[PDB]
Amino acid sequence: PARLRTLHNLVIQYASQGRYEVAVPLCKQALEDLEKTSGHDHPDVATMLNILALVYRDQNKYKDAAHLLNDALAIREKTLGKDHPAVAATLNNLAVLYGKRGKYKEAEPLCKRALEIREKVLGKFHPDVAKQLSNLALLCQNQGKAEEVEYYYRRALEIYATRLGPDDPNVAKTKNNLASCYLKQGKYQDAETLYKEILTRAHEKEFGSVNGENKPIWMHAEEREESVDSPTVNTTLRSLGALYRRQGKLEAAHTLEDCASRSR
Template sequence: MTQMTQEEIVAAVKTVAQGLEALRSEHTGILHSLHEAPDPVVSERAGLVQQSADMIELGLGEAQVIMALAAHLQLVEAEKQKLRTQVRRLCQENAWLRDELASTQQRLQSSEQMVAQLEEDKRHLEFMSSVSKYDQDVNEDNASEQSKSEKPDPVVDLFPDDDADDRHNMSPTPPNQLQLSQQVNAGYEIPARLRTLHNLVIQYASQGRYEGKYEEVEKYYQRALEIYEKRLGADDPNVSKTMNNLASCYLKQGKYKEAEVLYKQILNRAHEREFGTIDGENKPIWQVAEEREENKAKNKENVPYGEYGGWHKAAKVDSPTVTTTLKNLGALYRRQGKYEAAETLEDCALRSRKEALDIVKHSRNLLTDDRRKPGSAKDKNSRRGSRESLDMTYDGDEVSSNKCV
């Protein structure tokens, strides 16, 4: 027996319902005729006919229920198809929204990159604007400098350098040889932005514009240090010089930890350039000083400083920057109560200073003797080369300063 479909069932039910309607009409007519006859036998027949009529009514009711159920199923199926159509449409819309979201995210990412680039350009332009604004005051009248010479020098207060009085005396390069030393260093070009930035800080400090405004000085030196390290490399003397100035600025603000880190970094670099990689046997001077401080605190006998080797010779690497760093770090140790460590650094600075003065004195004697001796053009060229060699070897810091300014 094959399974009937819904349409076939509905059609069969309608046919049966029509047949039942016809039977109900016949039974109704038979009941009327039987009720008119008073015969008891007829009454018994009337009961059977009535029973058949009730069953016919029941069958008609069931047929109506089946047809109503079929109609309801058709409505449910129609709703189901409608919902399926909506689901397909929603799936299509979801896929479209996903595509739009991906496209929007890409545009947002590119916009964020553009905004970041524009912000960086804006900061750069603001920085250049401030540089151009303040650069107009670089060539002011020098009359005010003479009146301010009687006051404490703010540059010395901002960047303390105990060798400031001896810098010109320690330099083996006479003033009339400045042009010659600049020619020797013609290949060492410093970008214009670095020169301007360095001039700004020195000029404003000398004019007293940054008295108490160490945060602004800190910002300028951090910017200068970043540019120096990026353009000239971490081993350039100007990097150590700027780090020393930044550390001095930290000291003025009470940021002793930051200043100590920078001082030790300068000494580490000087040590590595002079003596090689730092290890357990090859220690920089600040580690030697702190070990002597620890031995003193533990009541241990310190080894004489001279037996640690000639670390003080490393001060010649960036003299007078390293010498200044030694003294500044020694002063910082004294603030912290590390007197033994401070004395070790100060002793090292004094030794390097004495050696530098001896070198300067000897170099000046050689220059004086050369001027007094008559010679050919070849001798003059030889003396010129000697001066250039002295400029490059012992006065690197001065040359670098002149190049920056």
């Protein structure tokens, strides 16, 4: 029905724009008009509810937002069915709210189910599944499930860099997180090798397939020991700089720190 059909869109059209105050009454009225004809159960009621709770998130009315999305998923599951992408998206969303509240163990099953729905709909090695694994890896980081963090970020990388570009920032993000998860574990050389990889991916795109003369930043310093515009790669210079502080390679930690200093 046009009456509702266009209004429903206007809600999205405005909530996205940032005109939340404009959106909320449209939403509210659309709700009362939606329930008159079709009732509580409807995919559009769910969509609209999600929009409302998305306003409540920004407002930091977290428990309300969470409850609202629970109701929305209860509607979404009956209408759209379990193992639906909408259901997955909702489970992902209402887990971020649960995580933010500090209910980390409560968000984990939601996320786990969501990932299982995503895998069913798309595939084992799909990028969204990877985004979900990345999301899931943080829920386990706060929990202190060190090994799981490694597994999930490790699985994420096997879906990122292979499907995506090697120089990609998402890939670097993951390789930076996973290398921190290794630092915690005591897998020091693994994290070191990871950081070297990160540096090399940027260094080659800036210059070209490295030769004796084109040598990378770390190789210069680790050799000096004997005798970068990116933020994600500056963090890397500093992070590897610490590993060389542990490795006793001071000159290396210094040259890395200096290069990082020169970038800011």
